[PDB]
Amino acid sequence: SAWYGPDRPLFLGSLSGEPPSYLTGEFPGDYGWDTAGLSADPTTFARYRTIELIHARWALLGALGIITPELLAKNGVPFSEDGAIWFKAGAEIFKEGGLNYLGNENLIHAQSILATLAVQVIVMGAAEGFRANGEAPGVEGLDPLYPGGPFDPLGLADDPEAFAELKVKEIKNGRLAMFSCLGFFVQAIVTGKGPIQNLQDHLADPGVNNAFASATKFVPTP
Amino acid sequence: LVLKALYFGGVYDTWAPGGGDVRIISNPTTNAAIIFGYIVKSPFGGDGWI
Amino acid sequence: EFYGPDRAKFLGPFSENDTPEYLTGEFPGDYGWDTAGLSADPQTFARYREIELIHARWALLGALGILTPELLSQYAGVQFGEPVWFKAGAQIFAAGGLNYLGNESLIHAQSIIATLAVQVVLMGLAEAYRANGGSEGFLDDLDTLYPGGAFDPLGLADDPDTFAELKVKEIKNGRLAMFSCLGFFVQAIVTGKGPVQNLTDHLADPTVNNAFASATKFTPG
Amino acid sequence: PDLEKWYGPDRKLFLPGGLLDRDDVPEYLNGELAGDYGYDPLGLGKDEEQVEKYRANELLHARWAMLAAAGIIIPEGLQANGADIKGGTWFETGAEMLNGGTLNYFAVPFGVVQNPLPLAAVTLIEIVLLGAVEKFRVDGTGPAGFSPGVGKFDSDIFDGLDKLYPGGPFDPLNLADDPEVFAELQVKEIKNGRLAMIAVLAFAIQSYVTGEGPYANITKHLSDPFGYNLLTVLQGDDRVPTL
Amino acid sequence: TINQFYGPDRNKWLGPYSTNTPPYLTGEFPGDYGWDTAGLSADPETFKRYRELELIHARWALLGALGMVTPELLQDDDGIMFGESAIWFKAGAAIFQEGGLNYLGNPSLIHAQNIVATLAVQVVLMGLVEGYRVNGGPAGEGLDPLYPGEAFDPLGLADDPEAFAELKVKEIKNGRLAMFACLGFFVQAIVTGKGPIENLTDHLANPAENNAFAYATKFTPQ
Amino acid sequence: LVDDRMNGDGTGLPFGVNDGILGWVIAGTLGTIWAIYFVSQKDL
Amino acid sequence: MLTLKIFVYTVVTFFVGLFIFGFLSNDPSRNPGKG
Numbered sequence A: 001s002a003w004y005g006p007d008r009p010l011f012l013g014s015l016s017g018e019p020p021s022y023l024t025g026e027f028p029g030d031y032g033w034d035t036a037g038l039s040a041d042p043t044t045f046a047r048y049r050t051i052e053l054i055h056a057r058w059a060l061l062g063a064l065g066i067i068t069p070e071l072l073a074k075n076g077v078p079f080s081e082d083g084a085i086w087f088k089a090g091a092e093i094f095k096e097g098g099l100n101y102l103g104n105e106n107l108i109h110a111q112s113i114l115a116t117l118a119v120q121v122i123v124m125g126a127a128e129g130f131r132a133n134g135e136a137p138g139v140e141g142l143d144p145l146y147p148g149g150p151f152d153p154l155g156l157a158d159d160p161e162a163f164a165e166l167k168v169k170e171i172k173n174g175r176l177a178m179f180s181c182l183g184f185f186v187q188a189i190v191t192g193k194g195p196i197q198n199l200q201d202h203l204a205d206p207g208v209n210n211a212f213a214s215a216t217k218f219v220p221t222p
Numbered sequence B: 001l002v003l004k005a006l007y008f009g010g011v012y013d014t015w016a017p018g019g020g021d022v023r024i025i026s027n028p029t030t031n032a033a034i035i036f037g038y039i040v041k042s043p044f045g046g047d048g049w050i
Numbered sequence C: 001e002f003y004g005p006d007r008a009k010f011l012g013p014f015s016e017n018d019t020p021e022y023l024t025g026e027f028p029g030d031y032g033w034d035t036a037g038l039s040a041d042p043q044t045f046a047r048y049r050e051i052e053l054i055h056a057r058w059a060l061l062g063a064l065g066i067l068t069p070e071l072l073s074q075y076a077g078v079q080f081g082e083p084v085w086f087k088a089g090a091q092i093f094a095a096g097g098l099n100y101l102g103n104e105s106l107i108h109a110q111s112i113i114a115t116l117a118v119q120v121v122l123m124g125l126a127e128a129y130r131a132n133g134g135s136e137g138f139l140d141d142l143d144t145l146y147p148g149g150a151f152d153p154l155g156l157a158d159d160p161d162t163f164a165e166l167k168v169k170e171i172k173n174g175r176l177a178m179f180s181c182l183g184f185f186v187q188a189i190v191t192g193k194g195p196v197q198n199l200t201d202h203l204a205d206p207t208v209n210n211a212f213a214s215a216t217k218f219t220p221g
Numbered sequence D: 001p002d003l004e005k006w007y008g009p010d011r012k013l014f015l016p017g018g019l020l021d022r023d024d025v026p027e028y029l030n031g032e033l034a035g036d037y038g039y040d041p042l043g044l045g046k047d048e049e050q051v052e053k054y055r056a057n058e059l060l061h062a063r064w065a066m067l068a069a070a071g072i073i074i075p076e077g078l079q080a081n082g083a084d085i086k087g088g089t090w091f092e093t094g095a096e097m098l099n100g101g102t103l104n105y106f107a108v109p110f111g112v113v114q115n116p117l118p119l120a121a122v123t124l125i126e127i128v129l130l131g132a133v134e135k136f137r138v139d140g141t142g143p144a145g146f147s148p149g150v151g152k153f154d155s156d157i158f159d160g161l162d163k164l165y166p167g168g169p170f171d172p173l174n175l176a177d178d179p180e181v182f183a184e185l186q187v188k189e190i191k192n193g194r195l196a197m198i199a200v201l202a203f204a205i206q207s208y209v210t211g212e213g214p215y216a217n218i219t220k221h222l223s224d225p226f227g228y229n230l231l232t233v234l235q236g237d238d239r240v241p242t243l
Numbered sequence E: 001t002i003n004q005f006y007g008p009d010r011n012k013w014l015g016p017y018s019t020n021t022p023p024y025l026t027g028e029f030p031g032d033y034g035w036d037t038a039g040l041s042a043d044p045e046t047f048k049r050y051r052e053l054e055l056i057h058a059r060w061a062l063l064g065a066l067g068m069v070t071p072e073l074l075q076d077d078d079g080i081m082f083g084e085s086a087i088w089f090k091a092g093a094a095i096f097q098e099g100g101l102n103y104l105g106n107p108s109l110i111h112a113q114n115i116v117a118t119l120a121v122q123v124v125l126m127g128l129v130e131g132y133r134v135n136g137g138p139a140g141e142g143l144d145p146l147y148p149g150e151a152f153d154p155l156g157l158a159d160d161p162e163a164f165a166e167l168k169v170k171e172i173k174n175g176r177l178a179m180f181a182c183l184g185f186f187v188q189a190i191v192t193g194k195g196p197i198e199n200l201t202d203h204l205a206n207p208a209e210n211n212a213f214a215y216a217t218k219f220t221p222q
Numbered sequence F: 001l002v003d004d005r006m007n008g009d010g011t012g013l014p015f016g017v018n019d020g021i022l023g024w025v026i027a028g029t030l031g032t033i034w035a036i037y038f039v040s041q042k043d044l
Numbered sequence G: 001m002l003t004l005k006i007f008v009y010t011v012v013t014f015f016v017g018l019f020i021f022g023f024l025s026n027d028p029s030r031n032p033g034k035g
């Protein structure tokens, strides 16, 4: 429904006014929102677009991985007490039983955080160096931000129209996931509980179990 | 109906102690789990749906 | 090397195809690292370069001055009153005030108001002079980042390529000092101990006394 | 805009199409005044200029009754909700200033100020101010002054002004420069004023019947509709149950 | 007098020690002391966005500083009008009081009970207002984005362009002072836990030791 | 007791779900059919 | 017995979903009429 061009929907609806001239609707997720003017020249606009999409994909994975073990623990998967919730799941590798995937001590059973971090550093350094270089020993001449090929095994991005629609879907889901991950961070800081527990408390009593209930817990004392 | 029961004399509670009486309902059950558990309850004996 | 198109870059074998067009290896410290595109505009690039250089020199001074009164209290046995840098400023609130090397005959300052007033006056005049680039007769013909007149009294920059390589040395040293100062700040926050104490504990037990040992300090309750 | 609903031959009438054929509307009401619903059942208007004179009377009444409705309903509600106000009930405020009594004026939301003016000073000031203002209105000429819109105006700014809709100094915020918005705001003015006139008559008759002000009436009725209404207060003693 | 705040000989942010004003700060816009040491406003469109945002922040901070100072000044001799809510950073919790938020302590004013309801009303109203400011609405359609001055200038005072320019300078300078004061309010609240007027009177009691250095060891780590 | 029972008759269980695996298999089967229908949607 | 309940729930959900999305699959268009 006109996700590109000068008839695209904008970020204040009919109250949007005229969008900035550099936001012409060429790129996915254009709602005419650069009120700070940070994307005014095209070089940093392109850099901000790749930064936004990388953040969006990372936050999609992060939101799914923040939700999933809490739901599994509430559905009977034996996460003990801290692997259940995301902002304490890191400490499990210091437990003498170790960090076991899905609570199964046969899976992973990791205890050396330094070894885990070193493996992550080397693997992600190779991967992000490849992404920055825009090339790999088997990947040559692809888009830096939408590579495809081996990164599109099932070939969903073959028709250009479907590709543009899926690009809009990806950026909108990723922005929702970034919004929800910011929510996860702030809710963990404020409430001190997992997001699923926050949702369950709110469903238990929405009138009094909300953020305003925690509005007085950070006030500075004389 | 809600306004009648809350402010305008209440409605007849047959479960009022002593044989039932007209009662003002205070704190109606607004819990979504309790409210929507009626509509997904089975209609058979001992459950009766809504 | 550190200049031109064949220069050292910030991702090595991964840098040849994503170096920004505006990073041509003209200025020192150009490893091609601009991923957010903050210095795409030339004027903003110049302002960011000068801000980085001022920060680098301030961080070189700060990294030397954070470690010196704690190394001297560690091995040299010099008494200070408070060797720990993030507790140093409170010395002026003590009974003996702030004595420079520890001995009460050096400074013995007891007025934070007076020392702040003197610092504000001196630093304001100095930074106004640096920003103005002179005072209409007091060196209006010097460079904004590398003045070179009475700021290079020993003349280490006589040869232009020596000057360029010394700029590279200065910017790499300053970036190392900025990284180390951020480390100083974060270590202070997460340990409550000086950097020398942190290094001593780490050398005492590497696999135990490390940052992950403080990974659960700021967990919310 | 959309002025066809209020002006011309296809405007809104006081009866719908199936009850009022448009050969039953009087000829002196043909949709050039605001609020023309074709409503003159008793023929108190006769021709266009009789309608104009009665519209002068209607517009002055409408504005006075809008001010009156606000000033009747607001102080009583403030007093009942806790403002230090005496005589908040609209038909009791006069007796509060009889034997040297004063009034408290609550400037919202800043606070109550005790008004030191006695009844004689109040009535003298009101008589002279209202007499001067109504003389100015009927003459179309004033002693000059300042307005927030057009600035320090001379005494000649009132010349050539419609007496009913002067504007200018009386329009500091404008909002009537466009003729279409001026016409529809005239319609809004006359409808609001007629509603306020009906409301003030309601206030008077309700106050006479129930012995209390309209805020008390609306609050007690909205707190017990079937237990507090006209028929209940006409009943008086509760009722002998039918059973 | 315009030369005092406009043109090349205007007042600058370092007095006589500011001859290297950035070339894009040409003394055209209100304020313009030649202060841009980071080059954030080198791009003209981003400079326009920054000017709009600065003026909006300036007006918000004028209102905010006045609203943060006013109820503490209007406190009585016994704290009966306003309780803890006399202090601005404790004002919001007033809506959780049993009598609700009564304006100026009078229960006939506002008497607001439901924070969710007042927040929803504010979201609707402020969304409509900001949409009008961006796009155009009941109070204007194509006026200036920063100085519409038709419905929002009821009293005149700006028909003369000279008075308009000097009042623009007055507005931006008062707004910058108010922004500085609001940042001071935030930092003072965080580091002291007392109201700004309480801080002022405490300082006036004995300025030698009633100062920020008396709290200089507050956030020290252990 | 002499034998084991699910003990689910009555008690008002939503969709008769006495174990969350039942809700999960309901959601999974419905979602799988929906996903098949949705990928095969501009088709007749 | 719980395994039997899980299997029966899966079977019933499968057939009900087939029914629902079958009538969702443009069913008023599957007729030999003109129009």
Ligand code: CHL
Pocket (backbone or CB within 6 Å): A212, A215, A216, A217, A218, A219, A220, E088, E089, E090, E091, E092, E093, E094, E095, E115, E118, E119, E122, E186, E187, E189, E190
């Ligand atoms: C727009 C700015 C704004 C600011 C700065 C505050 C600040 C505050 N509110 Mg608050 N509110 C604001 C808007 C609104 N509040 C409320 C409704 C409430 C309630 C109901 C309550 C508060 C409370 C509080 C305080 C929480 C205690 C604390 O230490 O918190 C953290 C704050 C500080 C440490 C002080 C320094 C603030 C400074 C860092 C702010 C500057 C950065 C901002 C976050 C700007 C971000 C953008 C905007 C959109 C927020 C706090 C000082 C509570 C209170 O008073 O408890 C005693 C409380 O109960 N607010 C509404 C809806 C009516 C608002 C807007 O619509």
Ligand code: CHL
Pocket (backbone or CB within 6 Å): C119, C120, C124, C125, C128, E011, E012, E013, E014, E015, E016, E017, E033, E176, E180
């Ligand atoms: C003649 C010399 C002169 C000097 C030196 C300055 C200097 C300054 N003017 Mg100024 N002005 C001068 C003349 C004039 N000004 C103005 C009009 C203005 C305006 C209108 C404004 C300024 C502003 C500024 C400031 C902008 C730079 C800045 O923020 O630096 C950074 C400053 C520092 C880094 C100093 C830090 C000192 C340090 C001791 C701080 C304290 C540290 C703590 C004790 C420890 C805490 C550490 C950790 C824990 C946080 C700056 C301090 C602007 C401003 O920011 O105002 C508030 C501004 O808006 N000036 C006029 C009238 C035309 C002048 C006329 O001569």
Ligand code: CLA
Pocket (backbone or CB within 6 Å): D016, D017, D018, D019
């Ligand atoms: C749901 C029923 C309904 C609907 C949608 C309509 C719709 C219409 N009627 Mg109406 N009509 C109805 C009921 C209805 N009628 C009833 C019950 C009456 C008897 C009082 C009439 C008698 C009537 C006449 C005689 C005329 C119309 C005509 C019209 C047309 C325009 C004028 C108008 O709105 O009526 C105007 C009606 C009123 C002003 C009555 C008051 C309406 C308010 C809104 C009542 C508030 C309703 C509220 C929700 C409470 C409902 C009570 C309920 C619980 C029992 C329009 C097509 C006109 C027409 O066709 O002209 C050619 C015409 O001449 N109507």
Ligand code: CLA
Pocket (backbone or CB within 6 Å): E059, E060, E062, E063, E066, E146, E147, E148, E149, E150, E152, E153, E156, E157, E158, E164, E167, E168, E170, E171, E174, E175
């Ligand atoms: C002291 C600060 C100050 C000053 C100097 C100005 C100056 C300017 N503004 Mg304003 N502005 C201010 C604050 C200020 N503003 C605030 C806080 C807001 C947000 C409410 C605005 C919103 C605003 C808009 C939306 C517009 C302007 C316009 C104007 C111009 C018209 C002249 C004028 O306002 O008279 C100078 C101002 C004063 C003399 C006011 C100072 C004294 C007052 C009486 C204090 C009032 C305090 C009050 C109790 C706080 C509650 C206010 C609340 C009701 C909103 C002028 C350039 C208009 C314009 O450019 O038209 C061409 C325009 O469209 N401004």
Ligand SMILES: CC1=C[C@H](O)CC(C)(C)[C@H]1/C=C/C(C)=C/C=C/C(C)=C/C=C/C=C(C)/C=C/C=C(C)/C=C/C1=C(C)C[C@H](O)CC1(C)C
Pocket (backbone or CB within 6 Å): A033, A034, A035, A036, A037, A038, A055, A056, A058, A059, A061, A062, A063, A064, A065, A066, A085, A086, A087, A089, A090, A177, A178, A179, A181, A182
């Ligand atoms: C547009 C615009 C325009 C205008 O004008 C201006 C402005 C305003 C600037 C703008 C805006 C902006 C924004 C909104 C931003 C935001 C962002 C975000 C939020 C991000 C996030 C983002 C986020 C993210 C990434 C996230 C991610 C996450 C993750 C990974 C996670 C992970 C994890 C997990 C799984 C679990 C475990 O247990 C833990 C961990 C390990 C932790």
Ligand SMILES: CC1=C[C@H](O)CC(C)(C)[C@H]1/C=C/C(C)=C/C=C/C(C)=C/C=C/C=C(C)/C=C/C=C(C)/C=C/C1=C(C)C[C@H](O)CC1(C)C
Pocket (backbone or CB within 6 Å): C033, C034, C035, C036, C037, C038, C039, C055, C056, C058, C059, C061, C062, C063, C064, C065, C066, C084, C085, C086, C088, C089, C177, C178, C179, C181, C182
């Ligand atoms: C390149 C890039 C690319 C794209 O753009 C993207 C991005 C990412 C953005 C980028 C990056 C950036 C960065 C890295 C930044 C950083 C910075 C820093 C760290 C600084 C510091 C900095 C730091 C510093 C100065 C510091 C300094 C220090 C000092 C002075 C000290 C002082 C002292 C002393 C002596 C001692 C005592 O007792 C205390 C005190 C008093 C305290």
Ligand SMILES: CC1=C[C@H](O)CC(C)(C)[C@H]1/C=C/C(C)=C/C=C/C(C)=C/C=C/C=C(C)/C=C/C=C(C)/C=C/C1=C(C)C[C@H](O)CC1(C)C
Pocket (backbone or CB within 6 Å): E035, E036, E037, E038, E039, E040, E057, E058, E060, E061, E063, E064, E065, E066, E067, E068, E087, E088, E089, E091, E092, E178, E179, E180, E182, E183
């Ligand atoms: C120029 C330049 C250039 C170079 O080169 C670079 C740089 C450095 C970047 C620069 C600078 C900048 C700056 C200075 C900034 C700052 C700003 C601010 C401070 C703002 C505030 C701002 C501020 C603001 C808005 C504020 C506002 C406030 C408010 C609303 C308040 C409210 C309130 C009130 C009433 C009361 C209650 O009870 C509470 C509350 C609710 C709380």
